Symmetry: C3
Subunit: 267 residues, 3 copies
């Protein structure tokens, strides 16, 4: 999975006619049995998932939250598939992840409790990834909007995003940035995904295939950035330790950032 | 307490002549025995509490910090009243809350230690709410201003606000947003309360009855938002699952934000 | 160490010809054996440490990270010196600090794990201070830049900065702000230092002697803040408890901010 591109794509499990397209456009597809599908449509979604299989090495299935009758039906259904990685919505403790063993688990922390227990969830053995959800977050806080007038996330959402990035990285898990619900707001998605790439998120999860090209381009460093990385790496080959390059103190971790941009560009 | 409006108002306990005015203007009155009252005036303040009752169902009393002789004298003064809900300043541990049993406690976290321990404080059995305080926070950090030139809270205060909001919601406690000290700054207050309302705070604490109307208004969504909520919900009942509405991916938690808007207007 | 001014300065240990200049420019000097010095220059740095001593009372030595052969050689080298305070890079647990007993440790938290464990690190018995580092942080997250286009730290870094400030203050440890790598960027350094001084950081670490006067300046409150502090403290000497002053509500912690402004001026 860590070898798949950054362009991951949700597609509702009761929409099998879209599966192959989802697979085609995206790096990894998340087949959704949760919020994407109404309760009356779950069983059909579960039949589709087993009737219309995708490459299980590039497909994750978002099941329902722990302690729900739906999750048990999902697990019963997945029994009849070859999918080994699931996403857990409303992830709220290590126990919720651990009981999914031996499947690989991407924990979607999208509640206060989850936020408070982030590191615990990250540390759990089955965890291979962490994602965060702004909208469920606010909803469970009893709020009404995740962003301010100007489109930026409200503080608590920004806070949780950092918390999840830290928890995931501190335990060597993948970090996935939140979805961008404004389908046509290409510009905002781009800015969001450039920043996500810059701080070390591994994935930006998309909800529409038109988003994928934007995310992929956004995870390629700017031309001026690659130029810089090339320059500082070259200059460092004539240096021992800390030096000044173009007005700034360079040393090990900065050289590490440069290497990372060049790796991302090659990827 | 969950049943009162968002407009809470401090009034120092040594000004019994303002108690009825406060009760009249506010949803809940916080009678203050701590910072609002000089040490030399505390004993008279305590006398005021016993001599000028307010409806104990709409009235909270902020006592002094744990381990202080003042707190001991507050509790014995309080033995002569019907007040069963107290606010604990400088709340720094679960033990400080638990020791106040059997009273209900709103923890005011306004120290670094408090912030480090917020989740533990919120989980404590008597806790029914959490509030944060930016000014003691900065004071205890060794700092000198909680806000930038432009009026925004400095990063650490913004950080603690979110910490407390999450700690409270994670254990189902009321969340109270900090006081706005600039009494004539109606605009700043409104901007604060509007965002507090959006992110799930239940209350904005006020320090002047002129602020209640502002907080009450801010907690009722704008016309534009209510129109949208009506719209999204209406469409939602012809919808089954995730759909697109006005360019936005909509599902479950977005629907929940809309309900919450309408609930807040209804309230 | 809490008695020296806020202008701390890094100097790599491989460059002993600058030791006295740095000791002259700065309040405290951090002699560096880690990232400022290339692996092949380490042994000479160590030689230089023992052979070119500075006032141990105004010098801290940044050694290498826990569990490395380098750190072992560092301590071995320090045995022949009078330096009793060390800076610990990549601080990731209480155990890494505790093993440095009986030396005093400034923990430099600059990884996600460190951040997740900040309070644990802060509480450890040898810790006397905390510092954070944005660039190793970003590097370990798998990111490529600590700052946005406008120079502002990205969120996760801002988030980590507050974590450290809060962790260190919760256990009474010194707090040290991150270095400013853009040597020429006086204005940004000024703006960071000013804000660091406002939220209670004790120190801004510098990486070039030309930065120290900016930092010292930044930590001295502006003439306008000082006149305010004077004004408010004077008015307060005629008041009892909370009072309105120049449109703001004033009580204890506001009065404390004023005292701290005037203390920083006198210092
Ligand atoms: C929101 C949504 C229902 C919009 O559907 P829509 O109205 O058909 O959107 P469009 O009209 O723009 O679709 C255009 C094309 O993109 C395809 N498409 C859109 N979203 C897709 C998706 N999530 N997966 C696969 N294909 C998708 C459509 O099939 C269509 O393809 P086609 O024209 O070649 O036949 C759909 O985008 C979707 O399901 N998004 C994700 C929902 C989800 O999983 N939420 C759960 C977690 S947030
Ligand atoms: C700041 C403060 C001392 C100013 O008092 P002030 O100088 O009288 O200010 P104003 O002149 O504008 O007050 C006007 C009116 O509002 C009333 N008022 C102001 N603050 C009030 C309060 N907190 N509670 C009840 N009434 C209040 C006054 O009674 C006065 O009423 P009146 O005109 O009918 O006589 C006062 O607002 C106050 O005590 N606020 C709360 C402080 C506190 O509790 N701090 C501790 C925690 S933050
Ligand atoms: C980056 C660095 C090598 C720049 O070196 P430089 O190119 O010689 O810098 P300048 O040209 O601006 O030098 C200006 C003067 O200040 C001195 N100076 C610069 N940085 C200094 C430092 N960190 N300590 C002591 N003196 C320093 C120089 O020696 C020079 O003095 P001089 O004229 O008497 O010879 C130097 O700033 C440095 O080593 N900074 C700290 C690096 C470090 O320790 N990083 C680890 C943690 S971030
Ligand atoms: Mg969700
Ligand atoms: Mg206070
Ligand atoms: Mg570093």
């Amino acid at each position: 999975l860590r070898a798949a591109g950054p362009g991951w794509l949700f597609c509702p499990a009761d929409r099998p006619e879209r599966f192959a397209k989802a697979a085609a456009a995206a790096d990894v597809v998340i087949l959704d049995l949760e919020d994407g599908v109404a309760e009356a449509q779950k069983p059909a979604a579960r039949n589709a998932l087993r009737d219309t299989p995708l490459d299980p090495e590039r497909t994750v299935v978002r099941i329902n939250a722990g302690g729900t009758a739906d999750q048990a039906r999902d697990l019963e259904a997945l029994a009849g598939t070859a999918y080994t990685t699931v996403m857990l919505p409303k992830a709220e403790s290590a126990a919720q992840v651990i009981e999914l063993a031996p499947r690989d688990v991407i924990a979607l922390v999208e509640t206060a409790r989850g936020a408070v227990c982030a590191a615990e969830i990250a540390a759990a053995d089955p965890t291979v990834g962490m994602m965060w959800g702004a909208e469920d977050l606010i909803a469970t806080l009893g709020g009404s909007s995740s962003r301010r007038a100007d489109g930026a996330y409200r503080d608590v959402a920004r806070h949780v995003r950092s918390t999840i990035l830290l928890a995931a990285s501190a335990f060597g898990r993948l970090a996935l940035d939140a979805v961008h619900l404004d389908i046509l707001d290409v510009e905002g998605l781009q800015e969001e995904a450039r920043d996500a790439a810059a701080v070390g998120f591994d994935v930006t999860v998309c909800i529409h295939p038109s988003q994928i090209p934007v995310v992929r381009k956004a995870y390629r460093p700017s031309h001026e950035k690659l130029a810089w990385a090339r320059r500082v790496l070259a200059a460092s080959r004539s240096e021992r330790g800390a030096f000044a390059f173009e007005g700034q103190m360079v040393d090990s971790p900065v050289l590490t950032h440069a290497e990372t941009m060049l790796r991302r560009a090659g990827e």
